[PDB]
Design a protein around this ligand. Structure first.
Ligand SMILES: Cc1cc2nc3c(=O)[nH]c(=O)nc-3n(C[C@H](O)[C@H](O)[C@H](O)COP(=O)(O)OP(=O)(O)OC[C@H]3O[C@@H](n4cnc5c(N)ncnc54)[C@H](O)[C@@H]3O)c2cc1C
Length: 499
């Protein structure tokens, strides 16, 4: 192994105290930068929460819960009466009714401002059995999944691109589908990716890899049973498909991004990337993209490897820095394999520290890397905005977000400074497909949106103060260290697998 590759292997399951301790000073924002990041993060998060005046309205609500000393159920019933009184057309009639004589239809709506289904479920299940549950799972998947899908076909998705592209957004299209089980499956995914590249490239129409749309692909879609595939067959069979797609993307001058999947496939994806970057037909072209996951202990070591690879292959790599989408499965997998540790962090704040440390490493080498900072977290965004320094230029970096999740944050970000935006570009990850391809992606979105550790979940909790929401992760880690006795202890509820 090379020096940078050997270091990656050594860090695979590095103990968490050691890994967090090493990243802390690399992630620490200088005090004036930290202060600017805090103010911007607070600002962004405030406008998020309080679009349509969510907090101010809630404030006026609780204020009247005090003056009259009433309960929540008491307040709602009062509003229903108040609403019915305001529907009396003439004020003299309304006042005379209040003075002399002294319904809940919209009580549910007012309640938003302030059991027997188990019987129906037990009854329905026993009668209809597994085929019923199977349809309900399919129906729920489609209904919850619609918000995350941009179109059923690439033509439909592309036809919708102008609205946000004219506001300064960019796109990366993903033909949904992954973990091909059979040779036919992987062949179908290959054809779907090829069709998409032709369509995206014609829409791009020469706009290039920065301003114009690109495509995102999953290696597991291009090789049957990728999860256990051996190096020899991957190089013989997957790599020609990856090369073919990348050459076609180059002909249209669109970016082609290799998504990151489960941690035990990191090594083989680096081998594929290494071979790809030295193809003569890709010489002098900078459209190859690659995702790295900051929740992995190997991430900073992968960056050192990628920096060396960009130098040796004489290109600028497009690198999407993410936290990671597979955390729940990674924990379970490691616990089942009984190894020495985890390949991912076990406290969410450590992943945040890793992301900031990695972001600094990426921003330091603008000749070698175009960083693409994927996040829906207002603090993460504000930190990167300050860490990138004075004198932004469009080709320095971009943000990225998922369709159906990013819009309210990035509406403050992409666009003109005169319109109150930050004037930084954001590329929207745009899934494309029908219900038959949606399941795995939707499940990962449910885990992301439903976790009480997720920014998108915490910002919707109006009982959590803004300052806690955008708290600096390095300071959070030091506070834990002072309380617990050392830096970087694992999550108390996630012991090592051999325990
Ligand atoms: C445009 C885009 C493309 C992406 N592409 C990929 C990809 O190819 N591969 C991939 O794996 N991910 C990818 N992601 C990331 C993933 O889908 C989530 O969107 C992302 O991790 C959420 O981070 P956030 O900063 O928006 O949220 P935050 O809420 O600040 O962070 C949430 C993340 O913290 C991590 N986490 C949660 N709990 C713990 C814990 N107890 N210990 C340690 N870490 C924890 C998880 O990574 C979780 O997603 C992409 C994201 C975007 C926006």
């Amino acid at each position: 192994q090379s020096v940078s590759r050997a270091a990656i292997t050594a860090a695979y399951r590095r103990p968490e105290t050691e890994a967090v301790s090493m990243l802390l000073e690399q992630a620490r924002l200088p005090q004036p930068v930290a202060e600017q990041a805090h103010k911007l993060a607070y600002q962004l998060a405030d406008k998020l929460r309080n679009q349509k005046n969510a907090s101010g309205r809630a404030g006026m609500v609780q204020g009247l819960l005090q003056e009259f000393s009433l309960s929540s159920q008491e307040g709602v019933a009062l509003m229903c009466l108040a609403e019915a009184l305001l529907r009396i057309p003439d004020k003299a009639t309304r006042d005379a009714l209040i003075r002399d004589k002294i319904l809940f239809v919209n009580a549910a709506t007012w309640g938003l401002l302030f059991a027997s289904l188990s019987r129906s479920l037990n009854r329905i299940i026993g009668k209809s059995g597994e085929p019923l549950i199977r349809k309900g799972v399919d129906m729920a998947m489609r209904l919850m999944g619609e918000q995350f899908v941009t179109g059923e076909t690439i033509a439909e998705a592309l036809a919708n691109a102008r609205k946000l592209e004219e506001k300064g957004f960019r796109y990366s299209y993903d033909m949904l589908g992954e973990a091909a089980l059979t040779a036919a499956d992987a062949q179908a995914y290959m054809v779907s990716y090829q069709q998409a590249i032709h369509a995206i490239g014609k829409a791009s129409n020469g706009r290039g890899i920065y301003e114009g749309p690109g495509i995102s692909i999953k290696l597991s879609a291009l090789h049957p049973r990728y999860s256990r595939a051996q190096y020899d067959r991957v190089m013989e069979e997957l790599y020609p498909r990856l090369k073919s797609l990348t050459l076609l993307a180059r002909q249209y001058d669109i970016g082609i991004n290799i998504d990151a999947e489960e941690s035990d496939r990191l090594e083989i994806s680096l081998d594929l990337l290494e071979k790809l970057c030295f193809e003569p037909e890709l010489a002098g072209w900078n459209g190859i993209g690659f995702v790295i996951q900051a929740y992995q202990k190997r991430c900073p070591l992968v960056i050192d490897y990628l920096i060396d690879l960009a130098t040796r292959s004489r290109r600028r790599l497009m690198i999407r820095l993410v936290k990671g989408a597979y955390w729940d499965s990674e924990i379970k997998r490691a616990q089942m394999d009984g190894l020495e540790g985890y390949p991912v962090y076990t406290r969410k704040v450590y992943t945040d520290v890793s992301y900031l440390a990695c972001a600094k490493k990426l921003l330091a080498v603008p000749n070698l890397i175009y960083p693409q900072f994927a996040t829906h977290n207002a603090h993460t965004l504000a930190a990167i905005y300050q860490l990138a320094g004075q004198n932004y230029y469009p080709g320095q970096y971009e943000f990225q977000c998922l369709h159906g999740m990013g819009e309210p944050l990035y509406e403050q970000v992409t666009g003109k400074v005169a319109d109150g935006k930050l004037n930084r570009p954001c590329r929207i990850y745009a899934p494309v497909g029908t219900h038959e391809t949606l399941l795995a992606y939707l499940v990962r979105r449910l885990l992301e949106n439903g976790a009480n550790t997720s920014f998108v979940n915490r910002i919707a909790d109006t009982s959590l103060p803004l300052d806690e929401l955008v708290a600096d992760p390095v300071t959070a880690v030091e506070k834990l260290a002072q309380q617990e006795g050392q830096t970087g202890l694992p999550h108390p509820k996630i012991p090592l697998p051999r325990d």
